Paper text:
To gain insights into the mechanism of SUMO E3 ligases, we have reconstituted the complex between yeast Smc5/Nse2 with an E2-SUMO thioester mimetic, which contains a stable peptide bond between E2 and SUMO, instead of the labile natural thioester bond. In addition to the SP-RING interaction, SUMOD also forms an extended interface with a large loop of Nse2 (named Loop SIM1), which suffers a major conformational change forming a β-like interaction with SUMOD, reminiscent of a SIM-like conformation. Nse2 SIM1 adopts a SIM-like β conformation in contact with SUMOD, forming an extended antiparallel β-strand with several main chain hydrogen bonds. SUMOB binds Ubc9 like other reported E2-SUMO structures, through an interface enriched with electrostatic interactions: Asp68 engaged with Arg13 and Arg17 from the 1-helix of Ubc9; and Glu90 with His20 and the main chain oxygen of Gly23 from Ubc9.
Smc5/6 is a nuclear multi-subunit complex that participates in the recombinational DNA repair processes and is required in the maintenance of chromosome integrity. Nse2 is a subunit of the Smc5/6 complex that possesses SUMO E3 ligase activity by the presence of a SP-RING domain that activates the E2~SUMO thioester for discharge on the substrate. Nse2 is a unique component of the Smc5/6 complex that binds the middle region of the coiled-coil Arm of Smc5 and possesses SUMO E3 ligase activity, moreover, the SUMOylation activity has been involved in DNA damage repair processes. However, the SUMO transfer from E2 to the substrate can be enhanced by the action of E3 ligases, which facilitate substrate binding while increasing the catalytic rate for the E2~SUMO discharge on the substrate.
Residue numbers in the entry:
A (entry chain E): 22 to 94
B (entry chain B): 329 to 363, 740 to 773
C (entry chain A): 23 to 81, 140 to 267
D (entry chain C): 3 to 157
E (entry chain D): 21 to 98
C-alpha cells in the first residue's frame, strides 16, 4: 500500500511516507527543502547505490523503516 | 469421604476448563475465518464471556483445595 | 504418607498448569487492549496467591514470575522491567527499562519456540540451540560475552517470551504504527 | 536452509539499522541470482584520521554452517595495513571460531570492529610485512602510503 | 536537575536509566552487565567515543539527559 522511509542526514533522521509506486524524486526534494539545502547539493544512497530520480521504492524492495543515507558535495 | 467428593469435584473443574479452551479456540477459528460486520464482534464478545467463566472456574478450583489437608 | 504427599503436589502442579493455560489463552485471544485486562490479571493474581497460600501448608513455580511481569508485557511487549526494586534510596534505578528485540539471536528470525538457558538466562529459539548443540554435547553459550558453558540439557520452555511474542504479534495484528504523525506523506 | 534464512533476515535488519557511511549487500552470481553467502561491504574511515574520506571494500564469505562457524572477511588483493594479510584477509577476535566468535555477533558489530582496527592497529600481532615494517620504522611515510590508499578508495 | 536520563544500548536491546549525576558509572556498567547476563571484562563502553572509566561520574563527562552509552564486545585484531 504505502511505506515508511527513514532518511538520515548523519545525525537527524527525518522520516517519510510514500506510495510504493512513487518516483523517489519527490522524497528527495521533500527532504532537501525540509533542510533548505538545494537538491543537486545532495546524494541519496541505499545499499550503497546512488538512487536515481525515476526509481520507485517498489523497484528497490524497500519496506517499513528502511534507511536512506543522504550525503553532500 | 469429604476429601473424596472434593477430589472428584476438582477433576470436574479441570475437565470443565479444558472443554472451555476448545470452545474458545474453535470460535477464535470461526473468527480467524473473519465471519457484513456484526457476528464478528458478537462471536468475539461471547468469547469474552467464556474467559470470565475460565477465571471464575480457577477461582472455585483454588479455594476448593483448602480442603485436602 | 509419602505417596499421599507427592500425589497432592501432583494435583497442585495441574492447578498451576491450569492457571498457565488460562493466562496464555487470555492473551492469545483478547480484543480490546487497555486497562480492562487489569481486572483480568487482578482476579487471576489473587486466585494464584490464594492457591499458593493453601499449598504452603497442605502436602518456585514460573506461573508466579509470569504473573508479576504480565501487566508490563501488556503496555509494551518489548519492555525491559524496572526489575531493580528501589532498595531504600537506590539512586540509579533502572527506570522505564526500555526496548529489547524479539528475534532469536541465532535464527535471526522472530521466536516460534523460546528456550531459556538456566546457567545464564539467554533465550534462544529451540531450532537455534538444537542446531547449535548438534554433534557437540557442550559449547559456550551462543550469546556473546557469556562464559557459562551449556549443553542441550540446560534449557526449559520459556513462557515469558511466548507471551511477549504473542502480545507483540497481536499488538500489530490491528496496527503497529498506523499513520505515524512523523510520517510526512509525500504527495 | 537455516543459514540461508538467517542471512535473509540479516539483510533486512541491515537495511533498517546500519552505521552511517557503511554499506553491505550480497552479490549477484552468474545467473542473476543472489548469493546470500557472499557479500560486498564498504567501511568508511573515521574522520580526522588519515583513513578519513576513505571507504574501503571488503567481502564477506559465509560458510554453509553459519552461524556455527563465522565468515571470512577480505580486504582487496594487497591492502596496506599492519593486520590485513597480503591476501587481504583480516582476522578479528570476534571473527574467530577458535577465539570469540558467537552466533549473536551482528554484522554491524563486525564492520564497526574492523573500522576501529583501521586507526588502532594492534602491533602485537602483525599480519603483513610492508605495513608493519613502516609502522615501526617510520610512520612518517607509512602515513603517506595510508593517505594514498585512503584517497585511492573514494570512487 | 540532579538526576539524568541515560540510554544504554548494545546494538540489539537498550536500557534506559535514571542516575544521580554523582553516581560513579561502576554501578551502571555492573547493572547493564549483570542485567544482560554478560561478563564485565568482555565489554567496553562508549560515551561519545570515549572509553569510559569505571569510577567516573556523569557530570565529569558533562552528560545530559537522553545521552547514549554503547556497549560493544571488548575485542582485538592480529
Ligand atoms: Zn549464556
Amino acid at each position: 500500500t504505502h511505506i515508511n522511509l527513514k532518511v538520515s542526514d548523519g545525525s537527524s533522521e527525518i522520516f517519510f511516507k510514500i506510495k510504493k509506486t512513487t518516483p523517489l524524486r519527490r522524497l528527495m526534494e521533500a527532504f532537501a527543502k525540509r533542510q533548505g539545502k538545494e537538491m543537486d547539493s545532495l546524494r541519496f544512497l541505499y545499499d550503497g547505490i546512488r538512487i536515481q530520480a525515476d526509481q520507485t521504492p517498489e523497484d528497490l524492495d524497500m519496506e517499513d523503516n528502511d534507511i536512506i543515507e543522504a550525503h553532500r558535495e | 469421604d469429604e476429601f473424596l467428593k472434593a477430589k472428584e469435584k476438582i477433576n470436574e473443574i479441570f475437565e470443565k476448563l479444558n472443554t472451555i479452551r476448545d470452545e474458545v479456540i474453535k470460535k477464535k477459528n470461526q473468527n480467524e475465518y473473519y465471519r457484513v460486520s456484526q457476528k464478528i464482534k458478537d462471536i468475539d464478545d461471547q468469547i469474552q464471556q467464556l474467559l470470565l467463566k475460565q477465571r471464575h472456574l480457577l477461582s472455585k478450583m483454588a479455594s476448593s483445595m483448602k480442603s485436602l489437608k | 504418607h509419602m505417596l499421599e504427599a507427592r500425589d497432592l503436589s501432583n494435583i497442585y502442579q495441574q492447578c498451576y498448569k491450569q492457571i498457565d493455560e488460562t493466562i496464555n489463552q487470555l492473551v492469545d485471544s483478547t480484543s480490546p487492549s487497555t486497562i480492562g485486562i487489569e481486572e483480568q490479571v487482578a482476579d487471576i493474581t489473587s486466585t494464584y496467591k490464594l492457591l499458593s497460600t493453601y499449598e504452603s501448608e497442605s502436602n518456585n513455580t514460573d506461573t508466579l514470575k509470569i504473573l508479576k511481569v504480565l501487566p508490563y508485557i501488556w503496555n509494551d511487549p518489548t519492555c525491559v522491567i524496572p526489575d531493580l526494586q528501589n532498595p531504600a534510596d537506590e539512586d540509579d534505578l533502572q527506570i522505564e527499562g526500555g526496548k529489547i528485540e524479539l528475534t532469536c539471536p541465532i535464527t535471526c528470525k522472530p521466536y516460534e519456540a523460546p528456550l531459556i538457558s538456566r546457567k545464564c538466562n539467554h533465550v534462544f529459539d529451540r531450532d537455534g540451540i538444537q542446531n547449535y548443540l548438534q554433534g557437540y554435547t557442550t559449547r559456550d553459550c551462543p550469546q556473546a560475552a557469556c562464559s557459562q558453558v551449556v549443553s542441550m540439557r540446560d534449557f526449559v520452555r520459556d513462557p515469558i517470551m511466548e507471551l511477549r511474542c504473542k502480545i507483540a504479534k497481536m499488538k500489530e495484528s490491528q496496527e503497529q504504527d498506523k499513520r505515524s504523525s512523523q510520517a510526512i506523506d509525500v504527495l | 536452509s537455516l543459514c540461508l534464512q538467517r542471512l535473509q533476515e540479516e539483510r533486512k535488519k541491515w537495511r533498517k539499522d546500519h552505521p552511517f557511511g557503511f554499506y553491505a549487500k550480497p552479490v549477484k552470481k552468474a545467473d542473476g541470482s543472489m548469493d546470500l553467502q557472499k557479500w560486498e561491504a564498504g567501511i568508511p574511515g573515521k574522520e580526522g584520521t588519515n583513513w578519513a574520506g576513505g571507504v574501503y571494500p571488503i567481502t564477506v564469505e559465509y560458510p554453509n554452517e553459519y552461524p556455527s562457524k563465522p565468515p571470512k572477511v577480505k580486504f582487496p588483493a594487497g591492502f596496506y595495513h599492519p593486520n590485513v594479510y597480503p591476501s587481504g584477509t583480516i582476522c578479528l577476535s570476534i571473527l574467530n571460531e577458535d577465539q570469540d566468535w558467537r552466533p549473536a555477533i551482528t554484522l554491524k558489530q563486525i564492520v564497526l570492529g574492523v573500522q576501529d582496527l583501521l586507526d588502532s592497529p594492534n602491533p602485537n600481532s602483525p599480519k603483513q610485512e610492508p605495513a608493519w615494517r613502516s609502522f615501526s620504522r617510520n610512520k612518517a611515510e607509512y602515513d603517506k602510503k595510508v593517505l594514498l590508499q585512503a584517497r585511492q578508495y573514494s570512487k
